[PDB]
């Protein structure tokens, strides 16, 4: 369970980082959905 | 101070010392409709909620436009 | 909070229906098609 973060590998652009010529796959301020889930607030509201 | 003497017989005064009409027009034209549309729509979206048919929904809107276009017909009658 | 969940239900359902068309046609492109292979790929690419 270290399958959560997200990286770009800015040094070796294309070999390590696939499909980088498509924007939706690659953001400038990417999300971490696990944080969004694991905030206790967000769990309360849905149960609310 | 008010006066200072430069030299002999040379006196001089020294110099080295919410519009309503816009307050109305800005209210009539700009502020009313932006306050009205938020009201005039929310009074309708609630009314569209209880309904489940799509015929009435698209006729009330098109009736709302007619009743709102007359508002402009009166303005162009003015100067 | 609850409104913004309805803001998902539209999009997730939109993205689902659009996808489930392509999935149906690749089952058809396996059979009904001159040029089966590309239609399996074209309908993927438009999903990207």
């Amino acid at each position: 369970k270290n399958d959560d973060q997200f990286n770009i590998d800015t040094e070796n652009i294309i070999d390590n980082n696939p499909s980088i010529h498509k924007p939706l796959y690659y953001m400038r301020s990417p999300l971490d959905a696990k944080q969004i889930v694991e905030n206790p607030e967000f769990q309360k509201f849905l149960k609310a | 101070e008010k006066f200072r003497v430069l030299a002999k017989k040379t006196t001089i005064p020294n110099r080295r010392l919410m519009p309503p009409i816009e307050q109305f027009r800005t209210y009539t034209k700009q502020i009313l409709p932006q306050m009205e549309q938020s009201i005039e729509i929310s009074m309708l979206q609630k009314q569209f909620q209880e309904i489940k048919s799509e015929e009435l929904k698209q006729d009330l809107i098109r009736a709302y436009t007619r009743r709102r276009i007359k508002d402009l017909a009166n303005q162009f009658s003015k100067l | 909070f609850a409104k913004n969940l309805d803001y998902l239900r539209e999009k997730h359902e939109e993205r689902s229906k659009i996808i489930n068309q392509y999935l149906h046609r690749m089952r058809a492109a396996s059979i009904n098609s001159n040029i089966p292979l590309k239609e399996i790929l074209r309908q993927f690419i438009s999903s990207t």
């Binding site: 652009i13 294309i14 010529h21 924007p23 | 430069l6 040379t10 | -």
Partner: protein
């Protein structure tokens, strides 16, 4: 035709760039200095390396797709989203940058030329002394 040059053309040539320093890319022409800057960037850019590997293939797939329609008497035609997505950079928001008292005044007419000299003092005037 040999381009003669003048006594004055020597000030800029050597004072700007000293002979002690080595020679570098900045000493070259710009049209060549750019190609290096392209050769050093295109190896990393995803677009150019993708579009150029596949350029011939787009030129063929459009023909094979077209010949169907000539075989199936329908006029040729193009579909939507046959191609990949490529960045439309205009739609994307990129940075523009990476990152006492005196006065002397003149005035003029047809031929005259006035010069004013204001000093602090009483109301007092002179013209040509």
């Amino acid at each position: 035709h040999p381009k003669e040059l003048d006594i004055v053309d020597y000030g800029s040539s050597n004072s700007k760039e000293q002979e002690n320093r080595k020679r570098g890319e900045r000493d070259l022409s710009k049209d060549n200095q750019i190609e290096i800057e392209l050769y050093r960037r295109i190896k990393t850019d995803p677009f150019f390396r993708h579009y150029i590997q596949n350029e011939i293939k787009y030129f063929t797939e459009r023909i094979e797709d077209g010949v169907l329609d000539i075989a199936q008497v329908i006029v040729p035609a193009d579909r939507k989203n046959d191609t990949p997505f490529y960045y439309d950079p205009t739609l994307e928001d990129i940075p523009l940058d990476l990152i006492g008292i005196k006065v002397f005044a003149s005035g003029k007419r047809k031929t005259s030329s006035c010069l004013v000299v204001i000093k602090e003092g009483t109301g007092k005037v002179f013209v040509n002394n």
